[PDB]
Design a protein around this ligand. Structure first.
Ligand code: HEM
Ligand SMILES: COc1ccc(C[C@@H]2NC(=O)[C@H](Cc3ccc(O)cc3)NC2=O)cc1
Length: 394
């Protein structure tokens, strides 16, 4: 007697388990047990992942309903599971999205300067260097302080909430509420601070005093700051970190992108496609009975969209494990999701990774792991796959 297949399969973010392909072939939607003990449907083919993400009857807000089968415990107030919907309902979607493009004057130059300064410090200190804690994460944190318009010196404290905020836990996490409430208070003070005039928080501070938004709650304005900092920093930092591993493990690609930096955008798009940063499938709750492949998903059931199931599906991406810069469908991956909840920071995430990689390859053309790959320590029970340290030499 075996137990019901448990998710997630592996916290390792440097390789996809052979099991994913077997599962996609045999049972591209199948029943699994989550860490809470709930049952869920795991969807692992490109076709079925797209179907679920493009059908709004598979709801992200309803995953927060009391009594629902859960992938993991909430780490935010339940209304925040509907964050983007709340933002849209408040009339703020266009302004938020405009503030988080990489297009603001000087933003890309600030990113490049920051990356180069972080790399110069590592070179001065001497190998080995930790590219996660001393490059990718500080680069993400600095970027998001700039995008939000908040002081750079406030970044590290906000960042240190994230090792708990993005936990994937069976039970509620007391520290998550402590940090959430403190970070909300911080963002509320930012909105009241007359010196905060730029970035997302500068724009929200103005809209807050505009008569067209006089009934939007102060809680929502502060929540936008906390959530966009947290989601953005964790997602860009974790993606860049594991992209660097995939690049370092491919010396020929490292050398090609160093020699021909104009290929870095195509390279980053493939690194996005093969990325294992999301540790769990994307959760949705069925709000009706819906046929998905051979399974009639019933109202109230949990569905998990396995991004690497879609992105490594050979029926859509032939030779899926190979980085190929000339694919005919290069952005059609699901690394940024799809449908109603498509990532609003996708352009910023691309530019963060492109600039970080460009700077690394210029400063450290000889970059290589300083430990055997199996020695990386993969964070467990977390919503991203992250090596705790990424030791390199050059
Ligand atoms: C490479 C970096 C990034 C990756 C891989 C990524 C990935 C994703 C994915 C897969 C989703 C869909 C989640 C779902 O459907 O359940 C998503 C949504 C989201 N992302 Fe990103 N993201 C990145 C960068 C960012 C940045 C920079 C921000 C903000 C500054 C951000 C903010 C969000 C938000 C707020 C959502 C919710 C969107 C929605 O509900 O409508 N992300 N992201
Ligand atoms: C890209 O990752 C995600 C993750 C989750 C969601 C769904 C929904 N939307 C959000 O905006 C925030 C994100 C968030 C921010 C801070 C925090 O401490 C925890 C989570 N919470 C949500 O639950 C969307 C994207």
């Amino acid at each position: 007697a075996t137990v019901l297949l448990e998710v997630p399969f592996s916290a390792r973010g440097d390789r996809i388990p052979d099991a994913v392909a077997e599962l996609r072939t045999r049972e591209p939607i199948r029943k699994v047990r989550t860490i809470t003990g709930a049952e869920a449907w795991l969807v692992s083919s490109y076709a079925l992942c797209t179907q679920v993400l493009e059908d709004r009857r598979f709801s992200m807000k309803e995953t927060a309903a009391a009594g629902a089968p859960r992938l993991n415990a909430l780490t935010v107030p339940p209304e925040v599971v509907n964050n983007m919907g709340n933002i849209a309902d408040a009339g703020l979607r266009k302004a938020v999205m405009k503030a988080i493009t990489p297009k603001a004057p000087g933003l890309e130059q600030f990113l490049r300067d920051t990356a180069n300064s972080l790399l110069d410090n590592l070179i001065t200190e001497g190998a080995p260097a930790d590219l996660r804690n001393d490059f990718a994460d500080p680069l993400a944190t600095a970027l998001h302080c700039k995008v939000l318009g908040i002081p750079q010196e406030d970044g590290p404290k906000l960042f240190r909430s994230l090792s708990i905020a993005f936990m994937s836990s069976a039970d509620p996490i007391p520290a998550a509420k402590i940090n959430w409430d403190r970070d909300i208070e911080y963002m509320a003070g930012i909105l009241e601070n007359p010196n905060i005039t730029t970035g997302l928080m500068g724009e929200l501070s103005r809209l807050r005093k505009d008569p067209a938004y006089s009934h939007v709650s102060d809680e929502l304005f502060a929540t936008i700051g906390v959530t966009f900092f947290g989601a953005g920093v964790i997602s860009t930092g974790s993606f860049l970190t594991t992209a660097l591993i995939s690049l370092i493990q491919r010396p020929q690609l490292r050398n090609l992108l160093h020699e021909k930096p104009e290929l870095i955008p195509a390279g980053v798009e493939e690194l996005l496609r093969i990325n294992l940063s999301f540790a769990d499938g994307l959760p949705r709750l069925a709000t009706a009975d819906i046929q998905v492949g051979d399974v009639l998903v019933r109202k109230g059931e949990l569905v998990l969209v396995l991004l690497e199931g879609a992105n490594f599906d050979p029926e859509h991406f032939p030779n899926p494990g190979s980085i190929e810069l000339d694919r005919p469908n290069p952005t059609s991956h699901l690394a940024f999701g799809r449908g109603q909840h498509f990532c609003p920071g996708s352009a910023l995430g691309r530019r963060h990774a492109q600039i970080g990689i460009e700077a690394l390859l210029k400063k450290m053309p000889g970059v290589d792991l300083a430990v055997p790959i199996d020695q990386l320590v993969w964070r467990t029970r977390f919503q991203r796959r992250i090596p705790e340290r990424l030791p390199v030499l050059w």
